[PDB]
Ligand binder design. Structure first.
Ligand SMILES: Nc1ncnc2c1ncn2[C@@H]1O[C@H](COP(=O)(O)OP(=O)(O)OP(O)(O)=S)[C@@H](O)[C@H]1O
Ligand SMILES: Nc1ncnc2c1ncn2[C@@H]1O[C@H](COP(=O)(O)OP(=O)(O)OP(O)(O)=S)[C@@H](O)[C@H]1O
Ligand SMILES: Nc1ncnc2c1ncn2[C@@H]1O[C@H](COP(=O)(O)OP(=O)(O)OP(O)(O)=S)[C@@H](O)[C@H]1O
Ligand SMILES: Nc1ncnc2c1ncn2[C@@H]1O[C@H](COP(=O)(O)OP(=O)(O)OP(O)(O)=S)[C@@H](O)[C@H]1O
Ligand SMILES: [Mg+2]
Ligand SMILES: [Mg+2]
Ligand SMILES: [Mg+2]
Ligand SMILES: [Mg+2]
Lengths: 502, 582, 219, 96
C-alpha cells in the first residue's frame, strides 16, 4: 500500500513489532524471505527465524498415516498402507523439484481421484478403446486406401471382450501401489509402473525388436537390452544413471543406428533423444554450451542445453556421438554425470540424470579391430581396445563407464541383410508416389557384391544402392517412362540393373 | 456480478457451437479431469510447446461437459475463462485490482465449487497487477489455490514457464504439470480430418483427403519453425484461401495435394511441387544445360545431374542432404564454375549460394566462426554464419571453397552435416541440412592427375587419388561423401570451347550495352594457340582474351570511335587484334 | 469511442484521394489478400528492409477496397491504422494502457469483423512494459482481428521470432526491394503529383538517371 | 503531457504530422534528436536534419554589430568596436 503517501505497511506495524506488543507469527518462503525482506533490513531483525526443514521419508510416512482418512472420506475410496509407503519412497526418489510432503500427498490424492473416476463411469482400457473407436468411427465417416476398417473391427472386438469381462466382475476400489506408480509415470515420464503383459512381451523381445534395424553386433544389443531390463525390473543402481555405455569400432557398423533404434524402440521416434554431437566440442568452451553460462554473462537467463533438455523429460537417451572428436577435458562434466547423475547448470539448480541412458559412440580402435577381429575371442579384443582407450582417456572417466563394447567389421551376410533393409525403406519411399517395386535375386547379388569393402563398413552399400538403382530409376521416373500401377521389376543386364514395365 | 464483468463463459460458447471441434487428446483431457477432482490443488497447468493444442484441450473439455462425455462428477460444471487484461484495465488507484480479484474469489466461493476457472497464459496471472506495493494476482490467488477452492485450469508454454512461473516457486508448486506433447503424424491426420468440415464451411470449397495426408506429412518434414497440428492447418487454410481467390478472381474448385505443395514451396522454397512439363524437360536436360556453361568434365556434371534428379523424383534419402560432393582437380578447370553452373540452373542467379571460403579456416577455431560462440562468450547473440545462412534459406547450395587449405579438424562439423543433416549453433538450436548440396573443392591430387590422367582409366584414377585422400583425410570423413568425383586436365579443343563461351557472354553483355560484334576465326585461332598450357587451366586463356581483346576494344570505345548500331568486326593485325566499324 | 481517439481511417482518406496512386506491388497485395481471408491467423506482417514502401502496400490495399478490386469478402471493410506509440502515451499508473487497448478491442469487436487493423512498426507491440502481445494474442489467434502488421526484417527476427506465440499468430509476406526498372515505373507513376505540386516540369531522362545514380552511388 | 485519463501533446500532434495538416518547424539539440526522433518511424521520416552551425568569430562580430544599436538605445550607453572584437575573441577563447 505504499504510494506517494508512503506508509508501506511495514512501517506502521514496526513499533508494535519491536516493542513485542504484537505476537505476529510470520511464515514465508526461503527465497522470498531473502528477496523481499532482507532488502528492508530494519524489519528483518524484528522477527525470529524458525527454520522448517524438509522432512525425511519416514517422517513423511508418519505424516500421511493420519491425513489418510480425510482423503478417504473425500474421494470415498480406501488407501492401503503400501500405497502410502510407496508414495513417500517413490516421490522422494523420482521427483526432484517438489519437496516432501507436498508431492507425497499429491500422488496419494491424485491416485484417489483416478480410482474414483474408475468407479464412476468405467475402467481405463474401456475408455482407451472407447475413445479410439469413436475416433475411428468419425474418421471412417470422413473418408467417404482405407486399411482402417480392419483396425476399427479389431478395436470394437476388443472393446466387446473387455466390456463382457467387466460385466463378469459386476475391479479396483482401493489405492494400491500400482495406482501410485501410474500417477508417478504420468507425472514425470519415467516408466515406474507395473509392466502390463504386452509391454513385458515386447521387452523380453528387446533383441528381436532391435535386430530389425541393427544387424549383427550381438554384444552391444545384449548390453543395451540388459540395461533396459534392469531398469524396468527394478534392480538398477539408484544413485547412478541406467546405463552408461561406450561403443567402439570401425566406421559404419551401426553405432548411431543402435542409438536410433533405442530411441525408436523406447519412444517410437528416431530423433527423440538428447543428441550431443561431440564434434562441435573441439574447444574448452562447449563446456559452457552444455552447462550454460555463469551468472554475469550473456546466455545466463537462457539456460544450458543438456541440463534443460534433460530436465524437461527426465527419462530419455543421451547420445554423445563422435566422442573422440572433442577436447580431452570436456569429459569431466561427464564424470559428474556418469558417477552420480547430477549436473549443476549455470543458474545453480542441479538437474538429475539418474534415469537417462548415456551412450558414447567412437572409433578409437578401428585400425586394431579391423586388423584382428578374426582369430581373437571377444574378451581379448575388448581388453586390447580398452588399452587403446586408456591411451586416450583418463582412468577416472573409463572407470565410470557401465560397459565398453566393441563393434566389428561387417561380413557379407550382414550386407545382404542391410541391403534388404535399405531396399524395404526404398520400397516405402516409392510406394507413396504410387510405384510398386520387386527385385531379382540376381540383382540383390549385384548389390551385395558391388557394395562390399572391409574398411568402410556399410555405407558403400548405401551409396552403391543409391547409384546403381536410384540414379537410373529417378532418371526414368522423371522421364515419364515408368507409369504407376505396373510392378517395376529390377532385373539385370550384363553389368547394369535395368527397370522394366510388364 | 463480478464474474460476468470479467470472465468469459466457455460452456455457453460450446453450447452455442462457436468452438473448434476437438479430436484426439485423450490422456491429456483425462489427466486434467483427474487433477481437477482432487481434494487440495485442483490446479492443472497444461505445459506444452507453442502450437500443440494447449487451449484446444480446454475447449474440448468444455465440449465434453456440454455433451456429457465427462464423468458424473463434472456434469454441469461451468468452465469460466478468466481475463487478466479485463481485470488490470480499470484499476489505477491503490486497491481496485485487488478489490476486483477479491470479488471474483468471493463469487467463486459462492458458486458451490461448480466452476472450473480457466486462465490461458498463466504467466500473465503471475505478474498481473504488480505495482509499487500492490498484491498481484499471484499473491492473492496463492492461498485459494493451495486449498482447492479455486478449480483453475491454467495453460502456458514450455519455455515461458521457465521464465515466469519457476521464478516464483510457491505459485509454481500450486499447479500440477499436465504435459501436452506435440502430436505425431497420424494424430495430425486425424485432427485435420476433424477440422476439414470447418474450413470447408468457411471457404465454401472442398478438401480432398490426399491433400490432408500431404499436409500433415509435408508440414512435418519441411517446416522447421512452427509445430503440429498448427503448421499443417496453416497449409490447409492457405491453400483453401488460394483456391477461393483463384475461383473469385476470373480453373479448379477442389484443394488437391499439389496445392499443398505449392503453399509449401512458397513458405520455404523447397520445390516439393508437381513438375510442370517445361521444368521437367528442363530437368531432363540437366547435363546439357550445365554444358551450356561448363564444357569439359562430364563426370561430375553427370553426378550432380543424378543428385538433383533424385531430389526432385523423391528418391532422396530423407535423413541426409541432397548431395555431398567432393571436387578434385587441377587448378582452373571449373570446379567453382561447376558450382556456379549449379546456382545458375537451380536458382536463376549466379552467386545465389552459401559460399564458405575454407582457406580462411586454417586454425581450429574457425569452426567457431561457422557455428558461433557458446553461452558466455563474445559472439553469442550473433549466431553463426553457416547456421543462419541455412536456417534463413533452407533449400540452398553450400560450397566449401578450396577445402584443402584448412586445418585437418575443421571437418568434424561436417561429420555431423554429411551424416544426419543437422548442425547445432551456439544458441542451442539445430539447423536442418536435409535440403542443401554440400560441395567441397580440393586439389589434393592435382600433381598426380596432371601426371597420369593419360594411359589410366577413370576408375583406377579415382582409386589412386582416393587412396591419397585416404592418406589426407580421416576414414570417417571420406565415408560420408556422396561421390568423390575426379576432374581431368583440359585439352586444346576444350580451351577453344571455353574461349567460345567467354566470347559469347562478352557479346551478350556488349549487346546489352548496345553494340554488335563480329569476329574472324583467325582471332579465335590466335587466342587458342597463344595462351595454352595444361598446368594452369583456363585462366591464362581468359586473361589473354582480356588483354588482347579488351585493351584495344575499351581503348576505342571511350574515344567515341565505335558508334553504336554498326558492326564491330574483330579482325586481326599481323600479330594482334583490332576492330573496325563497317 | 476509442477507435477515433487512436486510429486513422485509411479508406476514408483514400475516398477523398489524399493517398498515393500505388502502382506495382501486385503480387504482394495478392498474398496479403490470401492471408486476410483465412479462418484463424488472419494477420499478415509485411517484412523487408526499411524504405521499400510497405505502408504503400497497405495504401494500395485501401485503394483497391475503395475501387472494388478485392474479392467478395472485403467489399466494405475499413482499414484503420493503429498507433502503438499513442497507446503508451500517458503511462503513469497501473492499468491505463490496458484500458485504452481494451477500448480499442471492444470497439473492434463491436464492428463485427468489418475493420482491417494496420499496426505499423510491429516491434513496438512486443515490449510494452503481460503487456501488449498478451491482449491481442487470443484475438489474433482466433482470426477475429485482422492485424496487418508491418515491420523491418531485422526488427522482426530480433523481437518477434524471439517470442514464438506472437510469431505464429502472424504470417510473413516478404517484401522484395524493387529493381531499378521498377523504381522507374514508380517515378513515372508519381511524376504527375509532383509536377502538380511544385508547378514545374520533370524531364524523364533525368528521372531514369536519378534512379540509376541513386541505385549506384547510395548503399 | 503527463496527465490522468487523458493524452499528452506528442501523441495528439502525431496524427497531424502524417496527415498533411501541419507545416511544423522543429528545433532541438542533436542528442535529444538522436534519442527521441531517430528511434521512432513516422516521427523520423516526417523530420529533416537542418543542421545549425555554431558561428564563427567574425560572424559573431557582424551579429553584435547588428544588435549594438538595440542595447545602446536600451541602456543609454555606447559600445566600442574594439570592445566588441575583444569580447568575441576572449569569449570564444575562455568560456566553455
Ligand atoms: N548393422 C547395421 N544395420 C543396419 N544398417 C546399418 C548397420 N550398420 C550400418 N548401417 C547403415 O550404415 C549407416 C552408417 O552407420 P553409422 O552407425 O551411422 O556409422 P557409425 O556407426 O556412426 O560410425 P561412425 O564412426 O559414427 S561414421 C547407418 O546410418 C545405416 O544406414
Ligand atoms: N486435438 C485438437 N483438436 C482440434 N483442433 C486442434 C487440436 N490440437 C490443436 N488444434 C488446433 O490447433 C490450432 C492451435 O491450437 P491452439 O491450442 O490454439 O494453440 P495453443 O495450444 O493455444 O498454443 P499457444 O500457446 O496459444 S501459441 C487451433 O486451430 C486448434 O483448433
Ligand atoms: N569446362 C569449362 N567451361 C567453361 N569455363 C571453364 C571450364 N573449365 C574451366 N573454365 C574456366 O576456368 C576458370 C577458373 O575456374 P575455377 O573453378 O574458378 O578455378 P578452380 O577450378 O576453382 O581451380 P582452383 O584450384 O580453385 S585455383 C573460370 O573462369 C571458367 O570460365
Ligand atoms: N509501388 C509504389 N507505388 C507508389 N509509391 C510507392 C510505391 N512503393 C513505394 N512508394 C513510395 O515510396 C515511399 C515509401 O513510403 P512508405 O511506405 O511510408 O515507406 P516504406 O516503404 O513503408 O518504408 P518504411 O519502413 O515504412 S520507412 C512513399 O513516398 C511511397 O509513395
Ligand atoms: Mg555415430
Ligand atoms: Mg493458447
Ligand atoms: Mg575454386
Ligand atoms: Mg511504414
Amino acid at each position: 500500500g505504499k504510494a506517494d503517501g508512503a506508509m508501506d505497511a511495514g512501517n506502521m506495524l514496526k513499533p508494535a513489532l519491536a516493542r513485542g506488543e504484537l505476537h505476529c507469527v510470520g511464515a514465508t518462503t526461503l527465497d522470498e524471505y531473502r528477496q523481499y525482506i532482507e532488502k528492508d533490513a530494519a524489519l528483518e531483525r524484528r522477527f525470529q527465524k524458525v527454520f522448517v526443514a524438509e522432512p525425511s521419508v519416514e517422517d513423511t510416512i508418519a505424516i500421511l498415516r493420519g491425513l489418510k482418512e480425510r482423503y478417504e472420506l473425500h474421494h470415498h475410496v480406501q488407501i492401503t498402507d503400501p500405497a502410502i509407503v510407496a508414495a513417500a519412497t517413490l516421490s522422494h526418489r523420482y521427483i526432484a523439484d517438489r519437496q516432501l510432503p507436498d508431492k507425497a500427498i499429491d500422488l496419494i490424492d491424485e491416485a484417489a481421484s483416478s480410482i474414483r473416476m474408475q468407479i464412476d463411469s468405467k475402467p481405463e482400457e474401456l475408455d482407451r478403446l472407447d475413445r479410439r473407436i469413436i475416433q475411428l468411427k468419425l474418421e471412417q465417416q470422413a473418408l467417404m486406401l482405407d486399411m482402417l476398417n480392419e483396425e476399427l473391427s479389431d478395436k470394437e472386438r476388443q472393446y466387446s471382450e473387455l466390456e463382457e469381462e467387466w460385466k463378469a466382475e459386476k475391479l479396483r476400489n482401493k489405492v494400491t501401489d500400482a495406482e501410485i506408480a501410474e500417477v508417478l509415470a504420468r507425472w514425470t515420464g519415467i516408466p515406474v509402473s507395473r509392466m502390463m503383459e504386452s509391454e513385458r512381451e515386447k521387452l523380453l523381445r528387446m533383441e528381436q525388436e532391435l535386430h530389425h534395424r541393427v544387424i549383427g553386433q550381438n554384444e552391444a544389443v545384449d548390453a543395451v537390452s540388459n540395461a533396459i531390463r534392469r531398469s524396468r525390473a527394478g534392480l538398477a543402481d539408484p544413485n547412478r544413471p541406467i546405463g552408461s555405455f561406450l561403443f567402439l569400432g570401425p566406421t559404419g557398423v551401426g553405432k548411431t543406428e543402435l542409438c536410433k533404434a533405442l530411441a525408436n524402440f523406447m519412444f517410437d521416434s528416431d530423433e527423440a533423444m538428447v543428441r550431443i554431437d561431440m564434434s562441435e566440442f573441439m574447444e574448452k568452451h562447449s563446456v559452457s554450451r552444455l552447462v550454460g553460462a555463469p551468472p554475469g554473462y550473456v546466455g545466463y537467463e537462457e539456460g544450458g542445453y543438456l541440463t534443460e533438455a534433460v530436465r524437461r523429460r527426465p527419462y530419455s537417451v543421451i547420445l554423445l556421438d563422435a566422442v573422440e572428436k572433442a577436447h580431452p577435458d570436456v569429459f569431466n562434466i561427464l564424470l559428474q554425470v556418469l558417477d552420480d547423475g547430477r549436473l549443476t547448470d549455470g543458474q545453480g539448480r542441479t538437474v538429475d540424470f539418474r534415469n537417462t541412458v548415456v551412450i558414447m559412440t567412437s572409433n578409437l580402435g578401428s585400425d586394431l579391430i579391423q586388423e584382428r577381429f578374426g582369430e581373437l575371442d571377444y574378451a581379448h579384443m575388448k581388453e586390447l581396445v580398452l588399452g587403446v582407450v586408456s591411451h586416450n582417456f583418463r582412468p577416472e572417466f573409463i572407470n565410470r563407464i557401465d560397459e565398453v563394447v566393441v563393434f566389428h567389421p561387417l561380413g557379407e551376410q550382414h550386407i545382404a541383410s542391410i541391403a534388404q533393409i535399405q531396399l524395404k525403406r526404398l520400397y516405402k519411399r516409392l510406394e507413396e508416389r504410387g510405384y510398386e517395386i520387386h527385385i531379382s535375386d540376381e540383382a540383390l547379388k549385384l548389390l551385395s557384391e558391388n557394395g562390399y569393402d572391409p574398411v568402410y563398413g556399410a555405407r558403400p552399400l548405401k551409396r552403391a544402392i543409391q547409384q546403381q538403382i536410384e540414379n537410373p530409376l529417378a532418371q526414368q521416373i522423371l522421364s515419364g517412362e515408368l507409369v504407376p500401377g505396373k510392378v517395376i521389376r529390377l532385373e539385370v543386364n550384363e553389368d547394369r540393373i535395368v527397370a522394366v514395365q510388364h | 456480478q463480478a464474474l460476468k464483468k470479467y470472465t468469459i463463459d466457455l460452456t455457453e460458447r460450446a453450447e452455442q457451437g462457436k468452438l473448434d471441434p476437438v479430436i484426439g487428446r485423450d490422456e491429456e483431457i483425462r489427466r486434467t479431469i483427474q487433477v481437477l477432482q482432487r481434494r487440495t490443488k485442483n490446479n492443472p497447468v497444461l505445459i506444452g510447446e507453442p502450437g500443440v493444442g494447449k487451449t484446444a484441450i480446454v475447449e474440448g473439455l468444455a465440449q465434453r461437459i456440454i455433451n456429457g462425455e465427462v464423468p458424473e462428477g463434472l456434469k454441469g460444471r461451468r468452465v469460466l475463462a478468466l481475463d487478466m487484461g479485463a481485470l488490470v484495465a480499470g484499476a489505477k488507484y491503490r486497491g481496485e485490482f485487488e478489490e476486483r480479484l477479491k470479488g471474483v474469489l468471493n463469487d467463486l466461493a459462492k458458486q458451490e465449487g461448480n466452476v472450473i476457472l480457466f486462465i490461458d497464459a498463466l504467466h500473465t496471472m503471475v505478474g498481473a497487477g504488480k505495482a509499487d506495493g500492490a498484491m498481484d494476482a499471484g499473491n492473492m490467488l496463492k492461498p485459494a489455490l493451495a486449498r482447492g477452492e479455486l478449480h483453475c485450469v491454467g495453460a502456458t508454454t514450455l519455455d515461458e514457464y521457465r521464465q515466469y512461473i519457476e521464478k516464483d516457486a510457491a505459485l509454481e508448486r500450486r499447479f500440477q504439470k499436465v504435459f501436452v506433447a506435440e502430436p505425431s503424424v497420424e494424430d495430425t491426420i486425424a485432427i485435420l480430418r476433424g477440422l476439414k468440415e470447418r474450413y470447408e464451411l468457411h471457404h465454401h470449397v472442398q478438401i480432398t483427403d490426399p491433400a490432408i495426408v500431404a499436409a500433415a506429412t509435408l508440414s512435418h518434414r519441411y517446416i522447421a519453425d512452427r509445430q503440429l497440428p498448427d503448421k499443417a492447418i496453416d497449409l490447409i487454410d492457405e491453400a483453401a484461401s488460394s483456391i477461393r481467390m483463384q475461383i473469385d478472381s476470373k480453373l479448379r474448385n477442389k484443394v488437391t495435394d499439389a496445392e499443398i505443395a505449392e503453399v509449401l514451396a512458397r513458405w520455404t522454397g523447397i520445390p516439393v511441387s508437381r513438375m510442370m512439363e517445361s521444368e521437367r524437360e528442363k530437368l531432363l536436360r540437366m547435363e546439357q544445360e550445365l554444358h551450356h556453361r561448363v564444357i569439359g568434365q562430364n563426370e561430375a556434371v553427370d553426378a550432380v545431374s543424378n543428385a538433383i534428379r533424385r531430389s526432385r523424383a523423391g528418391l532422396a534419402d530423407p535423413n541426409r542432404p541432397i548431395g555431398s560432393f567432393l571436387f578434385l582437380g587441377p587448378t582452373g578447370v571449373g570446379k567453382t564454375e561447376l558450382c556456379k553452373a549449379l546456382a545458375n540452373f537451380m536458382f536463376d542467379s549466379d552467386e545465389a549460394m552459401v559460399r564458405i571460403d575454407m582457406s580462411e579456416f586454417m586454425e581450429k577455431h574457425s569452426v567457431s566462426r561457422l557455428v558461433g560462440a557458446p553461452p558466455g562468450y563474445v559472439g553469442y547473440e550473433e549466431g553463426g554464419y553457416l547456421t543462419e545462412a541455412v536456417r534463413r534459406r533452407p533449400y540452398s547450395v553450400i560450397l566449401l571453397d578450396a577445402v584443402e587449405k584448412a586445418h585437418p579438424d575443421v571437418f568434424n562439423i561436417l561429420l555431423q552435416v554429411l551424416d544426419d543433416g543437422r548442425l547445432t549453433d551456439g544458441q542451442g538450436r539445430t539447423v536442418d541440412f536435409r535440403n542443401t548440396v554440400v560441395i567441397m573443392t580440393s586439389n589434393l591430387g592435382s600433381d598426380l592427375i596432371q601426371e597420369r590422367f593419360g594411359e589410366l582409366d577413370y576408375a583406377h584414377m579415382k582409386e589412386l587419388v582416393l587412396g591419397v585422400v585416404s592418406h589426407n583425410f580421416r576414414p570417417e570423413f571420406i565415408n560420408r561423401i556422396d561421390e568423390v568425383v575426379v576432374f581431368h586436365p583440359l585439352g586444346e579443343q576444350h580451351i577453344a570451347s571455353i574461349a567460345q563461351i567467354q566470347l559469347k557472354r562478352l557479346y551478350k553483355r556488349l549487346e546489352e550495352r548496345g553494340y554488335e560484334i563480329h569476329i574472324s576465326d583467325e582471332a579465335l585461332k590466335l587466342l587458342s594457340e597463344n595462351g595454352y598450357d595444361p598446368v594452369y587451366g583456363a585462366r591464362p586463356l581468359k586473361r589473354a582474351i582480356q588483354q588482347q581483346i579488351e585493351n584495344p576494344l575499351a581503348q576505342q570505345i571511350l574515344s567515341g570511335e565505335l558508334v553504336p548500331g554498326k558492326v564491330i568486326r574483330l579482325e586481326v593485325n599481323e600479330d594482334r587484334i583490332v576492330a573496325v566499324q563497317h
